Ligand SMILES: *[C@@H]1O[C@H](CO)[C@@H](O[C@@H]2O[C@H](CO)[C@@H](O)[C@H](O)[C@H]2NC(C)=O)[C@H](O)[C@H]1NC(C)=O
């Protein structure tokens with residue numbers, strides 16, 4: 059019978075958080091339950107973790123310890139606003155609900171009807187983005203670009219990109235193709251960040267061919283009845 063050390067089980071504890079946040083698809087949790095009984099006197103089950111996540115991001119209000127509890131190895135707690143949720147295999151710098159001005163998550167359990175599709179150019183220039191769901195800022199003196207995503211419920215897919223996601227929920231690196239993963243928090247429904255920032259460094263020649271695929275959302279007023287309308291088309295935005 060092999061038991062985890064304090065730091066070993068903590069990484070797996072964070073590994074479980076990352077998996078539940080949906081920032082990772084893999085975990086190592088062999089030995090985590092015994093490590094919670096011994097070091098926390100608790101059952102480390104899925105219910106426990108979703109409330110740790112719920113409290114840390116939305117609901118908790120005092121100071122928190124490294125294991126995301128609010129007011130033995132972890133009876134000490136932090137005044138600063140973040141924990142480094144670091145499993146060893148992956149890490150994310152996550153800010154507590156306490157540290158922000160209000161709530162910077164949005165509820166995506168809500169129904170909204172599908173933004174109707176309407177034709178548009180397959181390739182969109184980075185410097186003339188007409189979609190409302192993201193906004194680009196270019197820093198030629200640092201040869202960096204930042205893409206602000208204003209509608210995170212609308213997918214942004216990365217291809218051959220190597221970026222840093224910045225947001226008021228968590229900050230983390232992404233290194234693989236596909237839809238940008240975001241922290242998912244359950245609180246009478248599923249919440250994701252209300253806005254996030256994709257930071258792309260051109261000094262790193264490894265994203266020489268970084269390109270973004272997204273649903274370009276167009277906001278309009280239909281002239282006949284005077285009401286606001288939303289439409290979308292698939293488009294690619296090339297960087298570098
Ligand atoms: C997140 O959105 C969901 C879905 O809109 C909310 O869940 C519903 O909440 C209402 C009350 O506001 C209940 O009457 C419904 O039964 C719930 N479920 C469904 C399927 O509609 C949820 O309350 C929202 N969460 C927050 C924190 O506002």
Ligand SMILES: *[C@@H]1O[C@H](CO)[C@@H](O[C@@H]2O[C@H](CO)[C@@H](O)[C@H](O)[C@H]2NC(C)=O)[C@H](O)[C@H]1NC(C)=O
Nearest residue numbers: 213214215216236237271272273274291292293
């Ligand atoms: C970004 O990637 C996601 C999947 O990672 C794409 O969503 C798929 O869209 C097709 C057609 O709409 C569906 O048949 C699949 O079931 C979807 N997959 C998932 C997991 O939802 C999305 O279309 C991609 N975006 C762009 C602009 O290409």
